[PDB]
Design a protein around this nucleic acid. Structure first.
Lengths: 55, 235, 183, 37, 324, 50
RNA sequence: UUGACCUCGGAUCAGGUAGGAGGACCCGCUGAACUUAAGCAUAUCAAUAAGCGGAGGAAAAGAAACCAACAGGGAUUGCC
RNA sequence: AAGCUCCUUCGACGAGUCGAGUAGUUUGGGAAUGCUGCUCAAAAUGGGAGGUAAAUUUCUUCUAAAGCUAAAUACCGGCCA
RNA sequence: AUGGGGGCGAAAG
């Protein structure tokens, strides 16, 4: 319902384009911890997969 | 249906607010009175007597109108009647600071984009009214550190060509020298009282009119002899 | 379930819906007064979990507070300052608890839940008759709200040795020389 | 010219903002409602 | 009703003026030659434009009128219409008290030369020199008296504010016009247009006292490396830069700036001393109110030697060794 | 050249920053794309293209 | 045309409430210097005195996002 | 109305808050001792704090960002003795 | 009713 923050939109764009290591680095720079960046990246990748199977 | 009349009314009211809040200073009024309008605003032209139911008087001694108009000075003088992407200018301290940050190997284009995907991004600005946009701009300015190099660079960037002339510098030194001279002109010994007679046991200044006074006694004599003995022992 | 839906929607703040709503409200609150009354909580789930009820006796006040610092840093928060100002305005009410609503770039915004201690419904209902008791006058001024406890460091552990049970009381207890009758 | 009261001006400005701002889908679908019959 | 009448009159007037100026521009671009039966319509349109500049500059479409004057002052063939438009713009630059007209004109003509690659008749440059901004008991009722008194205080405070804003705006316009003029001067210098040197150096010499001190020293070393480039016609350029250097340093303000600004003429003195022999043995010496743009190398050398041997200041301080 | 230095002093180049390039003694000037990023970051309308 | 809802107001409308004093002890904000020592500077005085805000007969704290490494303890407070 | 017991049924726990960077202030306490401001900004077999070279980050112990509560404790002021 | 010290700077500060 709510959607995505601008930084999450940037991470989504990077993950769709294939810059996954860049996405993870930007997620670190925006959150502050490796584990939080990993969880955010996994959540956004799952959102991408769900959107793909929904379309 | 689209709120067009309401939009015009609100815009006019906000503009009137702006003009009165600016003209309650009279320096804005002077600037408005003096400043000349542009031509990109004029562009567009080409570039009952209810009545009842029942020899000339002004004889000016000498058509006359034509012979008085076309016989003018200019009509008598006249015989036989290279021109063929907008530029980006930094004028802001924050923009100059971030320009320094790019010039020096501090942050790159990737860092610029990543930091540009912030909370202020994706904010609508196109179709919003002037009052809303100005309130948002006034109260939503992000704060960033500013560097002295960027501030100085803006200073020489905006420094006027005739801002520092030899004359005004020389007579500025002249006012400063005159100010020190006047301060010096505005700026333009100690007596000893023996505490005997009328001066014995007095709370404050005696009747001796002087700038600085010092009271003396035999106890002070002995103290001074002790201090001199100590100084002599030290030397 | 609406309360958890609102809790998650408030957790996701930079989401598009919440960002849009916060922008419009931030504009509306700037047009409104520095301290003004609310009608209904703009964050009903937060107000409810902080203790707001829809009874005759509970009121909301939205307060604007200027952000920044004095390089000196003010030991009390902007949240505590908002509570103290709202109390000085409504001296006849007890400040129950405040919560964040908007932030912009010049002012933070806070909705403060306040309770009337002289109202009959409040006096008859337990769970709030404690705030009817007279020992709770100006909790926001004495630092007895949540912000006050956080700033006072009223937590248990080895990281809070000098501040728990009162910082000045602890310093006095450590700096008193106790002399007994038989020494 | 004439001066409107503050609350009236505020609510009409809220009208203008609601009509002008680009609205997210979750509120645009609330803008879409059903009909008389 | 009177306000509407005034609005209609003013809008009709401005529309008519726009049409009149467009017709004048078309008649201006029209071909001059005709059967010899009086002054051509192009010349008369030029006279009309000149009269409008000299009468109502402050009014609208001053940009259009000045642009027409610029298309005339951009074709290089001395004619009566040229001398007329030179005189009209000179009158403009010597009667403008506010500055916007001068600013628009200087910007237009500056872009004109920039587009024309500096192939002008030196008259557009002398317009820069012609800038001066770069230099009975009537009975009164009880109500009437109070309103007049209030108007008196209002006009006093308005006059004070007007004076302040006038000074600020005059300074700003002056700064901008110096910017355009000196931009043209240095870009002509770097272009090294042989027929512009005298006028551009005259302008440099006569406005460097209003230009800042650091830029004044930059001007001295620009003169220096132009002399060096001429070292590596040539005599004319060398003597021109030399006379400009002496004139600049014989200006009173630069005279007092001297030591504090570290302005030394030793290089120019040595250049003159080492070039006297070539100036003696070259042929073109005599093939030729101004102080710099002098067509004869003989009079140029005369100014050089008057400056060195008899400088207008400290005449009894000149080094005897240099003298001899 | 002193003439070019004075010309810049009057009208500074588009990418003028006032810094000295460590790589070469010439002044370090911004590029067109760098100024594009300057405006994009200062306005916030387009953090990234497409 | 009418009537609701929402928001914002008025009333010498009905009923209440706040101010100030006190401040020994209590809860907060703010906050020195004299002094001591040290080549110098941090430090000490002192998270004190002065100033400001707020309660009571006590106030505050208080029922672990604690202590621990135990064979475990078990809200807070105070004495050794 | 209430307590226990049993189970082929369920079991909801506090967000501009943690946390990262940084400036100030404060403490015996850069695992930042706590607090404040500022920029970014979370999780759900989760999070906090400790233990440990023992071979991987195992083990131990609690649930923060909501609230109330007498007593033992302080007292140069109030009514007294 | 008002103005109050110093240095830097063309003032604006």
């Amino acid at each position: 319902v709510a959607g995505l923050a601008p930084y999450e939109r940037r991470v989504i764009e990077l993950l769709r384009n294939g810059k996954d290591k860049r996405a993870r680095k930007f997620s670190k720079k925006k959150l502050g911890t490796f584990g939080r960046a990993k969880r955010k990246c996994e959540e956004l990748q799952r959102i991408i997969a769900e959107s793909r199977r929904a379309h | 249906e689209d709120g067009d009349q309401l939009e015009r009314e609100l815009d006019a009211m906000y503009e009137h607010y702006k003009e009165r809040k600016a003209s309650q200073d009279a320096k804005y009024r002077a600037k408005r009175a003096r400043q000349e309008v542009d031509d990109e605003e004029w562009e567009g032209l080409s570039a009952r007597l209810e009545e009842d139911s029942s020899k000339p008087l002004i004889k000016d001694l000498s058509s006359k109108r034509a012979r008085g108009f076309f016989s003018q000075d200019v009509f008598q003088k006249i015989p036989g009647l290279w021109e063929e992407r907008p530029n980006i200018d930094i004028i802001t301290a924050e923009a100059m600071t971030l320009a320094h940050q790019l010039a020096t190997g501090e942050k790159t284009k990737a860092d610029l984009i990543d930091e540009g995907y912030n909370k202020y991004a994706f904010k609508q600005k196109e179709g919003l009214p002037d009052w809303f946009l100005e309130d948002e701009a006034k109260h939503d300015k992000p704060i960033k550190p500013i560097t002295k190099e960027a501030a100085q660079a803006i200073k020489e960037k905006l420094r006027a060509l005739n801002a520092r002339p030899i004359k005004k510098v020389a007579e500025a030194r002249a006012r400063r020298k005159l100010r020190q001279a006047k301060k010096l002109e505005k700026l333009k010994q100690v007596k000893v009282v023996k505490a005997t007679g009328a001066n014995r046991g007095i709370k404050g200044r005696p009747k001796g009119v002087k700038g600085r006074y010092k009271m003396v006694d035999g106890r002070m004599k002995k103290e001074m002899r002790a201090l001199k003995r100590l100084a002599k022992k030290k030397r | 379930g609406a309360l958890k839906y609102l809790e998650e929607l408030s957790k996701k703040k930079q989401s598009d819906v919440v960002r849009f709503l916060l922008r419009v409200r931030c504009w509306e609150y700037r047009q409104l007064n520095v301290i003004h009354r609310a009608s209904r909580p703009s964050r009903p789930d937060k107000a409810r979990r902080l203790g707001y009820k829809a009874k005759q006796g509970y009121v909301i006040y939205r307060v604007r507070v200027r952000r920044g610092g004095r390089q000196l840093k003010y030991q009390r928060s902007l949240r505590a300052t908002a509570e103290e100002r709202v109390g000085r305005r409504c001296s006849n009410l007890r400040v129950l608890n405040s919560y964040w609503v908007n932030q912009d770039s010049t002012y933070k915004y806070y909705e403060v839940i306040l309770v009337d201690p002289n109202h009959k419904a409040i006096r008859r209902d337990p769970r709030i008759n404690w705030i009817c008791n007279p020992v709770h006058k100006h909790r926001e001024c004495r630092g007895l709200t949540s912000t006050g406890k956080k700033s006072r460091g009223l937590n248990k552990g080895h990281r809070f040795n000098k501040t728990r049970a009162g910082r000045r009381k602890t310093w006095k207890r450590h700096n008193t020389l106790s002399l007994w009758r038989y020494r | 010219m004439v001066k409107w009261p503050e609350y009236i001006r505020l609510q009409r400005q809220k009208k203008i903002l609601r009509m002008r701002l680009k609205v997210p889908p979750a509120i645009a679908q609330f803008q879409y409602t059903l009909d008389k019959n | 009703k009177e306000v509407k009448r005034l609005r209609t009159y003013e809008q009709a007037l401005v529309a008519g003026y726009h049409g009149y100026l467009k017709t004048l521009a078309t008649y201006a671009a029209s071909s001059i030659p005709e059967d010899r039966k009086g002054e051509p319509i192009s010349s008369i349109a030029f006279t009309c434009a000149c009269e409008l500049v000299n009468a109502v500059p402050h009014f609208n479409f001053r940009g259009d009128l000045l642009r027409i004057l610029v298309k005339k002052l951009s074709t290089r063939k001395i004619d009566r219409d040229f001398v007329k438009c030179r005189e009209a713009l000179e009158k403009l630059f010597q009667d403008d008290e506010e500055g916007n007209a001068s600013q628009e004109a200087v910007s237009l003509l500056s872009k004109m030369m920039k587009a024309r690659e500096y192939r002008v008749d030196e008259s557009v440059l002398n317009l820069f020199l012609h800038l001066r901004l770069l230099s009975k008991w009537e009975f009164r009722t009880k109500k009437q008296r109070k309103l007049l008194k209030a108007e008196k205080e209002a006009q006093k405070v308005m006059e004070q504010a007007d004076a302040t804003v006038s000074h600020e705006e005059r300074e700003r316009i002056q700064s901008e016009i110096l910017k355009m003029v000196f931009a043209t001067y240095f870009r002509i210098l770097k272009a090294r247009v042989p027929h512009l040197m005298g006028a551009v150096l005259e302008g440099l010499a006569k406005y460097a006292h209003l230009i800042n001190q650091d830029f004044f020293g930059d001007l001295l070393e620009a003169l220096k490396d132009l002399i060096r480039d001429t070292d590596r016609d040539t005599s004319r350029e060398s003597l021109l830069c030399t006379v400009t250097a002496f004139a600049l340093l014989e200006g009173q303000d630069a005279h007092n700036a001297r030591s504090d600004l570290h302005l030394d003429l030793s290089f120019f003195i040595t250049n003159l001393y080492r070039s006297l022999l070539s100036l003696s043995l070259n042929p073109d010496l005599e093939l030729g109110n101004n102080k710099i743009n002098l067509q004869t190398t003989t009079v140029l050398l005369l100014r050089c030697l008057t400056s060195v041997l008899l400088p207008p200041w400290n005449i009894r301080s000149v080094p005897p060794i240099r003298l001899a | 050249d002193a003439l070019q230095n004075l010309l810049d002093s009057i009208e500074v180049p588009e990418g003028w920053t006032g810094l000295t390039d460590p790589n070469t003694g010439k002044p370090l000037n911004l590029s067109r794309d760098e100024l594009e990023l300057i405006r994009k970051v200062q306005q916030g309308l387009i953090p990234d293209d497409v």
